[PDB]
Description:
PDB class: structural genomics, unknown function
Entry title: Solution structure of the retroviral Gag MA-like domain of RIKEN cDNA 3110009E22
Assembly: monomeric
Name: product of RIKEN cDNA 3110009E22
CATH superfamily: Gamma-retroviral matrix domain
Keywords: structural genomics, RIKEN Structural Genomics/Proteomics Initiative, unknown function
Amino acid sequence: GSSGSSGTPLSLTLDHWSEIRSRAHNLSVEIKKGPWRTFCASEWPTFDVGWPPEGTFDLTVIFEVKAIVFQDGPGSHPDQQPYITVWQDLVQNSPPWIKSGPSSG
């Protein structure tokens, strides 16, 4: 099971901003490294769902923010939509810079 106290997602992501930007291109979306942080600074963790200030690669927690983000009305976040989306893509396609393991076989 996953359990450790080292390295953060926000940092892991920001570190591989290039990758985050790539996922956006493949998704046909554009994002910044300034807001990406802000939104993951005190925006997502301030939505009231269970999102940490450091971030998390939990589809569950992701879907939570995405839920509010992809909500109905002026509340929806069309700017974070592409941001939270990537976060979702990250989980799905867990990168090696994110999840490291031997993987026997």
